[PDB]
């Protein structure tokens, strides 16, 4: 009978079964747990201002071989420390 | 539609009973259960020779409807039907393949053995399975000399006969040649027997 | 066979088939007018009769039950139905 119940009065089993199996998605689990506000440094937001603490030079992953020229940024709205890439040629000379 | 003479004459019944064309296989295919008549103890089934003659005459009517006669290809891979196929070939138009079929004969249009029959007759649908399989690729009707155990896969006109005996195979090919010539008009009258007597169609040693 | 008469199957086929798997299901059992060598009276005994059947006047066992048909015992005579 292809798995699921089919009968006319079996809508609660289908609805609760979809509600239970709906949690295995990444986006539904993330959105209903609200992990963008609990974690993930920008608290659900797109952009955030911070204050540079130190310029880092990150080793690029293999097989690439370069220094990636990032900064360590402490966010104003959280106090969380993140690492941010300064994304062009030069441009680490531009920050401070 | 066949008026009165195409009934099984008692002389033809003498031929079919004396050649043991009515001795069917012990195991009977479910598609060949129509041709069985009341299996005897020891398990040997009895082929209905009336239905054998009717299917033989129907096969002869199908053979004598292809306009040119040299593309009614007669197949025998078996020693009991080599001479029967070659004499059928000599008496009718009837391109023979006596011996090895050489696969790629009905497909494979660049071989030396490339034929396009409008009809294929086979002595045995088991041993001649390559001819039937290859005729299933290029739209060719198949008349077979089936037994009660031989498969009817891609077989359109199954003449139920004894495949084990050489006398049965040679007689059925002889009768098919005779009926095709009678339908063509090469034999003048259906009532007199053919002057060709049935022992040039049997396998011999030596 | 790809074409057949299912309304009128042959009696040899219907007598081969199971009693539930025929066109209309009915029993293959029957009843027997059975008389003893001794007594003159007639007893109606089932074929698959499950019971040591006696007469009303007899003391004698007419049939003994088995796995299928009852075995009509001891030289008694029978007639169908």
């Amino acid at each position: 009978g292809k798995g699921k119940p089919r009968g006319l009065n079996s809508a609660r089993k289908l609805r609760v079964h979809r509600r239970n199996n709906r949690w295995a998605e990444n986006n539904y689990k993330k959105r209903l747990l609200g992990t963008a506000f609990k974690s993930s440094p920008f608290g659900g937001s797109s952009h955030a201002k911070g204050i540079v603490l130190e310029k880092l030079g990150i080793e690029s992953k293999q097989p690439n071989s370069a220094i990636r020229k990032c900064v360590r940024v402490q966010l104003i709205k959280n106090g969380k420390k993140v690492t941010a890439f300064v994304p062009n040629d030069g441009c680490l000379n531009f920050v401070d | 539609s066949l008026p009165a003479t195409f009934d099984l004459t008692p002389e033809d019944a003498q031929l079919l009973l004396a050649a043991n064309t009515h001795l069917g296989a012990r195991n009977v295919q479910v598609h060949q259960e129509p041709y069985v008549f009341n299996a005897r103890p020891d398990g040997v089934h009895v082929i209905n020779v009336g239905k054998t003659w009717e299917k033989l005459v129907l096969a002869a009517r199908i053979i004598a409807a292809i306009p040119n006669p040299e593309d009614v290809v007669a197949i025998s891979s078996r020693t009991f039907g080599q001479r029967a196929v070659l004499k059928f070939a000599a008496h009718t138009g009837a391109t023979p393949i006596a011996g090895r079929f050489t696969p790629g004969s009905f497909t494979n249009y660049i071989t030396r053995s490339f034929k396009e029959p409008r009809l294929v007759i086979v002595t045995d649908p088991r041993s001649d399975a390559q001819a039937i399989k290859e005729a299933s690729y290029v739209n060719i009707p198949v008349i077979a000399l089936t037994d009660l155990d031989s498969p009817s896969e891609f077989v359109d006109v199954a003449i139920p006969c004894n495949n084990r005996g050489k006398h049965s195979i040679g007689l059925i090919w002889y009768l098919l040649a005779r009926e095709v010539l009678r339908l063509r008009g090469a034999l003048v009258d259906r009532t007199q027997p053919w002057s060709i007597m049935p022992d040039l169609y049997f396998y011999r040693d030596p | 066979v790809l074409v057949q008469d299912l309304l009128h199957p042959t009696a040899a086929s219907e007598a081969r088939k199971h009693k539930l798997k025929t066109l209309v299901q009915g029993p293959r059992s029957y009843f027997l007018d059975v008389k003893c060598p001794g007594c003159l009276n007639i007893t109606t005994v089932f074929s698959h009769a499950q019971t040591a059947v006696t007469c009303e006047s007899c003391s004698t066992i007419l049939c003994t039950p088995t796995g299928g048909k009852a075995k009509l015992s001891e030289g008694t005579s029978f007639r169908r139905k």
């Binding site: 006319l8 | - | 074409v3 057949q4 299912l6 309304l7 066109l23 209309v24």
Partner: protein
């Protein structure tokens, strides 16, 4: 256990029509089966069908001619308003020009075309095309 004799009947009809048989045998032969088969026969998808009366539930031998592609059952018998018959026809039928969605309607068991001409609707049984 046996929950839909119409589904069993129409499955037997499909399975014999796929293998090319000219007849089926159907057990156990309900009124819904008889009316569904009468609609199919009216539209030409089967031939004569004959009801064997044993004294229990009946059997049917249907003569399948050659013209059936897929008869089937929509289980459960969904409630079908008159506005969404055409969703069901667009879903189940191969074209707008043929094929019929059979409805159980309080004016009788009928296809969707003369459900529309009678302006009636109701539960869905299945389809034939």
């Amino acid at each position: 256990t046996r929950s839909s004799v119409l589904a069993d009947a129409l499955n037997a009809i499909n399975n014999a029509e796929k293998t090319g048989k000219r007849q089926v045998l159907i057990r156990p032969s309900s009124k819904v089966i008889i009316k569904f088969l009468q609609v199919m026969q009216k539209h030409g998808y089967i031939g004569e069908f004959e009801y064997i009366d044993d004294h229990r539930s009946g059997k049917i031998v249907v003569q399948l001619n050659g013209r059936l592609n897929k008869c089937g059952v929509i289980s459960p018998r969904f409630n079908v308003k008159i506005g969404d018959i055409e969703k069901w026809t667009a879903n189940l039928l191969p074209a707008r020009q043929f094929g019929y969605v059979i409805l159980t309607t309080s004016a009788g068991i009928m296809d969707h075309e003369e459900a529309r001409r009678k302006h009636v609707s109701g539960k869905i049984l299945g389809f034939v095309y």
